[PDB]
């Protein structure tokens, strides 16, 4: 158990791998007689650690301007995309322009138009499709990789529940929700479930997901570029 004070609060999100330096101490709340069913333990005080340090596991502008000002930026970027994979120059260029992406535009009427690109790939097994998806996931600043049916311990789309104890609306971040402005790679496009398949239509079209349950109606934002692979 860890105790953080003052400015150390909210520096760590649950799930992070951390190295913490602190003081090993015990709780002090006076004295009290042992209670409960078990009274074998005598003179035992609960212990904790008081946290004191946490570690979580302008010049570049000119460099980027020089890189983009060349006449051969397109070829350099295309070659930079997966040099290990033989061939597929057009596919690499398409992947690069997908990574850069377009621009979204609003209108006075309030309607919005999509600014992200979606791609589909079909082919026989052994054409190195998963490798491209992994390279895109690693290269993109924000990237998610799924198997179509969700993942080991996370679904493809968000879900909403209500905690009976606290009566609060808890939302589980799905694969699409966890990415905002990034790239979502989807292998095995054929094996999608019905509800996820229905939701992905709205996710691709309006980049939003609408969920309505007892006493709640919400519209979450999912501005995700989609890169998909499927088999014959």
């Amino acid at each position: 158990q860890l105790y953080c004070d003052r400015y150390l609060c909210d520096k760590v999100v649950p799930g992070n791998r951390v190295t913490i330096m602190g003081i090993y101490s015990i709780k002090k709340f006076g004295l009290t007689t042992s209670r409960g069913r078990d009274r074998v333990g005598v003179g035992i005080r609960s212990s904790y650690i008081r946290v004191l340090g946490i570690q979580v596991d302008p010049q570049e502008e000119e460099e980027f301007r020089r890189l983009a000002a060349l006449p051969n930026v397109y070829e350099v970027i295309s070659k930079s995309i997966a040099p290990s994979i033989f061939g597929g120059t057009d596919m690499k260029k398409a992947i690069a322009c997908l990574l850069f992406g377009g621009s979204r535009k609003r209108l006075p009427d309030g309607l919005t138009r999509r600014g992200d690109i979606n791609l589909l790939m079909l082919g026989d097994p052994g054409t190195a499709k998963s490798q491209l998806l992994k390279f895109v996931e690693k290269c993109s600043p924000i990237g998610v990789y799924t198997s179509g049916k969700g993942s080991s311990a996370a679904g493809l789309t968000a879900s909403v529940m209500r905690d009976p104890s606290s009566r609060n609306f808890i939302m589980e971040g799905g694969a699409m929700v966890l990415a905002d402005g990034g790239v979502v790679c989807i292998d095995e496009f054929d094996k999608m479930r019905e509800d996820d398949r229905v939701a992905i239509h709205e996710a691709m079209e309006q980049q939003t997901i609408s969920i309505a349950k007892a006493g709640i109606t919400t519209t979450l934002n999912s501005r995700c570029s989609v890169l998909a692979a499927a088999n014959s």
């Binding site: 006075p108 609408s210 109606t217």
Partner: protein, 609 residues
């Protein structure tokens, strides 16, 4: 000394009648309306006195007490007669706080004893409870009355004589507690939400309900550790509200509305339908139907308690990429109470209110559904074909009479569901087959179609001229950039200003209506209650008879929906809506002719070989 100076400054703030002030008129209105709460803009106070505003923001309780005292003195000076009823008045706050605009996630101890503004959703509410202010007791043995004030309950006299309580002579005030949770649309993904507790007193008790988005301005304070020889050193923080607002009218635009109506008259409906959505090209009949939904019909109740529906329902079917979802989103944006519910997004338990047994008290309570919340509103259903049959059966009752009947042993109720429905669905074959009859393509039961009022079929005909016009419009809209924004940057008049890209050189002869003026006019028209005339009734009846007898005059064309008794009500409702479109009092012939033309267009379609 400081409190007296603050009171003097607050008193000086209110006396603005000789300085173009409005607060005196506000106080007069409050006295007229029997209200004892005044809302003061923080921005105006900061403009007039920055030091007082800073002191109030950094120190709330003392400054608020001083301001309440100043308001008491001011109301006394105006009419001491009114001030006798209430002991003290209460203060409301409004404006832009800036750094103190704090979300539930960002609340910290740095804002203690300050005034903060929060925006959130309500999740927990408590029953209204009375709280004692003063107590009066009487002694039958000695015929003596005693008074106590609260800010120990006596039971016996000095000579141990019993005391009897006078409940009527006592003073009680309302009290309630609510919970506010951070909106999921703004909370980081994958993280648990955080909540705040708010206390409501006096007239603010019944201004919030669970599942609603509110904005609350109030003071932030700690609760002292309760009695005990040992303390843990941790205090609970609870917000004390002073103003609650439901997040969502002018004065001189009435003249503009009257002039526009008295001028255009007949052209009002055509202009409103034309300017519904510039971003979408074509589909005039669909826009007219959407405008009719926005206006709506007239609900009628009679002596026997019978109810006649006044809402309209429209179902759109067509090929992909014909701008149906765009229309649904536009209706969602424009309509005041609009709720989107996709096919498999919500089930029958979500669309319809349910019963849950409360573990705290052992009772059974009702939780409202999606359609229950949208009373006198619009519900949009995309991917309507994917919806299960049971959900359609549940929706049937709302579409028929707009009411929901619920009963689980120990409780039974009927809730109002007077709403309107937009539905978007795809053909069974993916794309609309021209040769096959509409019955095979739609693939829906006759009852569901009959309960719908209008059916529209949209086709993506690849005509070169239509394609050229659509491409022109789409690229003109895409090339547009908002004025005042630098090129390459990343991310009220009745008639809208002409734009070279949004409208075009040819469209200079005509103009589109502004959104705000359109909303105001729609609201005013919805207020109006038209009356049907005798001339139109016979015409409508004869045309209904002609429509029913058209079975022998249909030629090679087929009918999209069966013609039943509900079609006559649909005709009358569309006529009433079109009469509402232009501010009038009676139904005319052209009013029924428009609805007849709409029915002619909607109900019959040619079949290609």
């Amino acid at each position: 000394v400081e409190l007296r100076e603050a009171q003097r400054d607050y008193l000086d703030f209110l006396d603005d009648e000789e300085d173009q002030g409005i607060y005196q008129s506000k106080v007069r209105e409050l006295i007229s309306d029997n209200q004892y709460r005044l809302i003061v803009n923080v921005n105006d106070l900061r403009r007039k006195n920055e030091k007082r505003a800073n002191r109030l923001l950094n120190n709330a309780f003392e400054e608020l007490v001083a301001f309440q005292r100043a308001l008491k003195d001011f109301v006394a000076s105006i009419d001491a007669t009114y001030a006798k009823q209430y002991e003290e008045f209460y203060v409301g706050l409004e404006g832009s706080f800036g750094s103190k605009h704090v979300s539930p996630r960002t609340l910290t101890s740095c804002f203690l004893s300050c005034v903060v503004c929060v925006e959130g959703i309500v999740t927990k509410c408590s029953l209204v409870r009375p709280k004692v202010v003063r107590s009066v007791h009487y002694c039958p043995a000695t015929k003596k009355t005693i008074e106590r004030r609260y800010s120990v309950y006596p039971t016996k006299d000095e000579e141990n004589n019993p005391l009897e309580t006078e409940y009527g002579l006592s003073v009680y005030k309302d009290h309630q507690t609510i919970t506010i949770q951070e909106m999921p649309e703004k909370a980081p993904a994958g993280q648990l939400p955080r909540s705040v507790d708010v206390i409501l007193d006096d007239d603010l008790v019944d201004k919030a309900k669970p599942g609603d988005r509110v904005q609350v301005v109030g003071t932030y304070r700690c609760l002292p550790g309760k009695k005990g020889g040992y303390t843990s050193g941790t205090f609970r923080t609870v917000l004390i509200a002073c103003n609650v607002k439901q997040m969502s009218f002018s004065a001189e635009d009435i003249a503009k509305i009257k002039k526009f109506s008295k001028t255009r008259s007949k052209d009002i409906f055509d202009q409103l339908a034309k300017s519904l959505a510039p971003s979408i090209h074509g589909h005039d009949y669909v826009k007219k139907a959407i405008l009719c939904l926005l206006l709506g019909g007239v609900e009628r109740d009679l002596e026997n308690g019978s109810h006649i529906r006044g809402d309209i329902n429209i179902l759109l079917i067509g090929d992909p990429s014909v701008a149906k979802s765009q229309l649904l989103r536009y209706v969602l944006c424009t309509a005041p109470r609009a709720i989107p519910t996709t096919g498999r997004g919500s089930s029958g338990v979500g669309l319809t209110a349910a019963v849950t047994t409360d573990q705290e008290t052992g009772e059974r309570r009702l939780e409202a559904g999606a359609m229950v919340l949208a009373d006198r509103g619009v519900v949009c259903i995309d991917e309507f074909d994917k919806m299960s049959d049971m959900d359609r059966t549940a929706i049937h009752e709302v579409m028929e009479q707009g009411r929901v009947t619920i009963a689980k042993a120990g409780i039974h109720a009927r809730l109002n569901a007077r709403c309107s429905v937009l539905a978007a669905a795809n053909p069974v074959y993916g794309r609309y087959d021209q040769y096959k009859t509409p019955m095979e393509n739609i693939g829906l039961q006759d009852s569901l179609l009959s309960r719908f009022d209008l059916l529209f079929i949209m086709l993506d005909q690849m005509d070169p001229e239509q394609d050229r016009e659509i491409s022109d419009h789409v690229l003109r809209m895409h090339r547009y950039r908002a004025p005042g924004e630098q090129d390459g940057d990343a991310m009220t008049q009745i008639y809208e200003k002409h734009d070279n890209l949004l409208h075009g050189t040819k469209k200079k002869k005509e103009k589109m209506v502004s959104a705000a003026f359109m909303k105001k006019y729609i609201h005013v028209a919805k207020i109006i209650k038209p009356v049907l005339t005798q001339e139109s009734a016979t015409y409508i009846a004869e045309e209904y008879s002609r429509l029913r007898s058209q079975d022998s005059m249909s030629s090679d064309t087929a009918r999209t929906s069966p013609v039943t008794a509900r079609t006559l009500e649909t005709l009358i409702r569309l006529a009433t809506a079109h009469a509402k479109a232009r501010m009038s009092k009676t139904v005319d012939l052209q009013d029924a002719e428009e609805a007849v033309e709409l029915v002619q267009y909607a109900y019959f379609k040619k079949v290609l070989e």
